[PDB]
Write an enzyme that holds these catalytic residues in place. Structure first.
Site, PDB file in Angstrom:
ATOM      1  N   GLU A   1       0.851  -1.190   0.000  1.00  0.00           N
ATOM      2  CA  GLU A   1       0.000   0.000   0.000  1.00  0.00           C
ATOM      3  C   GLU A   1       0.890   1.244   0.000  1.00  0.00           C
ATOM      4  OE1 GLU A   1      -3.474  -0.717   0.105  1.00  0.00           O
ATOM      5  OE2 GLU A   1      -2.850  -2.829   0.235  1.00  0.00           O
TER       6      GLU A   1
ATOM      7  N   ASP B   1       2.688  19.814   2.684  1.00  0.00           N
ATOM      8  CA  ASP B   1       1.669  18.881   3.152  1.00  0.00           C
ATOM      9  C   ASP B   1       2.066  18.181   4.443  1.00  0.00           C
ATOM     10  OD1 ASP B   1      -1.036  17.751   2.436  1.00  0.00           O
ATOM     11  OD2 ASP B   1       0.082  15.859   2.324  1.00  0.00           O
TER      12      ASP B   1
ATOM     13  N   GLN C   1       0.389  12.026   9.607  1.00  0.00           N
ATOM     14  CA  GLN C   1       0.683  10.858   8.766  1.00  0.00           C
ATOM     15  C   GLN C   1       2.082  10.788   8.162  1.00  0.00           C
ATOM     16  OE1 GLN C   1      -3.056  10.902  10.027  1.00  0.00           O
ATOM     17  NE2 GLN C   1      -2.068  12.577   8.861  1.00  0.00           N
TER      18      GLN C   1
END
Ligand code: CL
Lengths: 296, 247
Positions: A10, A125, A129
């Site tokens: 992923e 950004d 995460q």
């Protein structure tokens, strides 16, 4: 390419193997990129990321260890970190992060961020995460996939709409000259979220987000932000909300904490504090480097 | 590049680090094989003026051609190329530079076509992998165009000056790149030379700081002035149709 003991982890341009060295049997992170599937060959984004990371060598920025070309593949060897900030914040949500650790993490993030802006690199950004942490109490900036380096974008927003919870308001207002301050804003929202365990601007999308900020920091004007009313996406018909008692927004924060957060959250990019500048802020007067136990 | 985006927080030392980086790239690109022979060659003239017109036609970012040239040179000096693959190499250098500095992607199929012959995208892409392997997959360089701004910063010039200055220096630098006798010179020297040609006795901060700048970079007054003449030669002998007339 052999000095490795691959394991899934992923990913980005496909997978992302966690692996071991053969000579050194050291944990490393492998990013796999295919050279034979796209019309133009090696993706221009991979090319830009590599040259970008090549210059970003600092302890608080995930380090690009090596670039290996094999067969129809290109392997990016990154240093390996156990997990990200989002997982951590979630593995102690009620328990909260100790101030010494929050201060240390914000301190390191401002160091990596200061190094970045000194090399004409905007992350664009930053968020939980892509802020990775290891077992030695370090946190590092990662995934410069939407970065703007040397004035050139690795990727533009137009297609990669991530999360808008940390996007500075000048970007949201279409300011055509935004710069390094946008990253400081992201850190400001992340610095708060750490402290409260909750996201600072829990906005729905695009539209809400901007209002979510207005309903919390008050609708800016030409006094607090000279030039707002001239922004491309500014609307005279906007609702005129007012500041909220910050003392109630990030409660557990001491007089220095809000003193640093309030400056990382200035509407005006010209008044907003810089990374370098924040490093000398008193809130970092007594900064240690605790090392958490990771929930791995 | 929309000018010198994201550069306000830079301090002299950062700009120096960048200069040191172009110094090293110049070296890596210079400890080549038959250096002078490549720069004086007639085939290098055809290759650079070709890439140049291609960039003007496809209306490419103005930093594409500069990089494409820095990359073509290292490839020619760092490996053995057969004459049949010269034009192809020039196309790869162009294709790779676009992947770094271009907004509008530069297509291989279109380049193969411009190359004509038995050239195909598939061949150019196989050549691009082999080329990037040579460059260790690090394709961006610190160009003379890029240096122009690190130097104005170091000389604490006013924001408003950069534009006019960048635009005057660009054309001179491009001509310098097509001239082997001036293109083999260090990047800053070419930058400072063009800056001298445009700023000398016209801006006061230039005239007050140029000596120390040169000194910190180990450049003598003599070197600067000679370079200025190499650049003016480069400008006079530049012909957009060279690759047409001779090839
Ligand atoms: Cl509202």
């Amino acid at each position: 390419m052999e000095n490795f003991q691959k394991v899934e982890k992923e990913g980005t341009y496909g997978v992302v193997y966690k692996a071991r060295n053969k000579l050194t049997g050291e944990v490393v992170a492998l990013k796999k990129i295919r050279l034979d599937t796209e019309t133009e060959g090696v993706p221009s984004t991979a090319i830009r990321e590599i040259s970008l990371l090549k210059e970003l060598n600092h302890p608080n920025i995930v380090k690009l260890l090596d670039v290996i070309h094999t067969e129809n593949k290109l392997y990016l060897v990154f240093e390996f970190l156990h997990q990200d900030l989002k997982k951590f914040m979630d593995a102690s949500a009620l328990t909260g992060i100790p101030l010494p650790l929050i201060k240390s993490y914000l301190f390191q993030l401002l160091q990596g961020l200061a190094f970045c802006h000194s090399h004409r690199v905007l992350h664009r950004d930053l968020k939980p995460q892509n802020l990775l942490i290891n077992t030695e109490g370090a946190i590092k900036l990662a995934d410069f996939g939407l970065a703007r380096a040397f004035g050139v974008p690795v990727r533009t927003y137009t297609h990669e709409v991530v999360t808008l919870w940390y996007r500075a308001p000048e970007i949201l207002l279409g300011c055509k000259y935004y710069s390094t301050a946008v990253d400081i804003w992201s850190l400001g929202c992340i610095f708060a979220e750490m402290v409260t365990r909750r996201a600072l601007f829990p906005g729905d999308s695009e539209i809400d987000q901007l209002f979510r900020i207005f309903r919390t920091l008050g609708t800016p004007d030409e006094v607090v932000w000279p030039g707002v009313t001239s922004m491309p996406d500014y609307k005279p018909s906007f609702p005129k909300w007012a500041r909220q008692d910050f003392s109630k927004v990030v409660p557990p924060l001491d007089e220095d904490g809000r003193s640093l957060l309030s400056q990382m959250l200035h509407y005006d990019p010209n008044k907003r504090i810089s990374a370098k500048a924040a490093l000398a802020h008193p809130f970092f007067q007594d900064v240690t480097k605790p090392v958490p136990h990771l929930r791995l | 590049f929309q000018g010198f985006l994201d550069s306000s927080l830079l301090n002299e030392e950062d700009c120096r680090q960048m200069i040191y980086r172009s110094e090293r790239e110049h070296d890596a690109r210079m400890v080549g094989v038959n250096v002078d022979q490549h720069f004086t060659s007639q085939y290098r003239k055809v290759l650079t003026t070709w890439m140049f017109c291609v960039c003007k036609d496809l209306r490419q970012d103005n930093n594409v051609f500069p990089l494409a040239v820095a990359l073509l040179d290292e490839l020619f000096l760092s490996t053995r190329i057969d004459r049949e693959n010269y034009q192809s190499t020039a196309a790869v250098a162009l294709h790779i530079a676009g992947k770094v500095r271009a907004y509008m992607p530069i297509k291989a199929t279109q380049l193969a076509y411009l190359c004509g012959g038995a050239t195909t995208a598939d061949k150019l892409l196989t050549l691009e992998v082999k080329s990037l392997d040579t460059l260790s997959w690090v394709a961006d360089r610190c160009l003379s165009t890029d240096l122009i701004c690190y130097i104005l910063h170091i000389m604490h010039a006013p924001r408003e000056d950069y534009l006019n200055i960048y635009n005057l220096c660009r054309p001179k630098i491009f001509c310098a790149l097509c001239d082997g006798r001036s293109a083999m010179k260090r990047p800053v020297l070419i930058t400072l030379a063009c800056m001298h040609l445009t700023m000398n006795q016209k801006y006061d901060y230039y005239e007050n700081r140029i000596d120390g700048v040169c000194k910190s970079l180990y450049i003598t007054k003599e070197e600067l002035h000679q370079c200025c003449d190499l650049v003016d030669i480069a400008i006079v002998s530049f012909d957009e149709n060279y690759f047409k007339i001779n090839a």
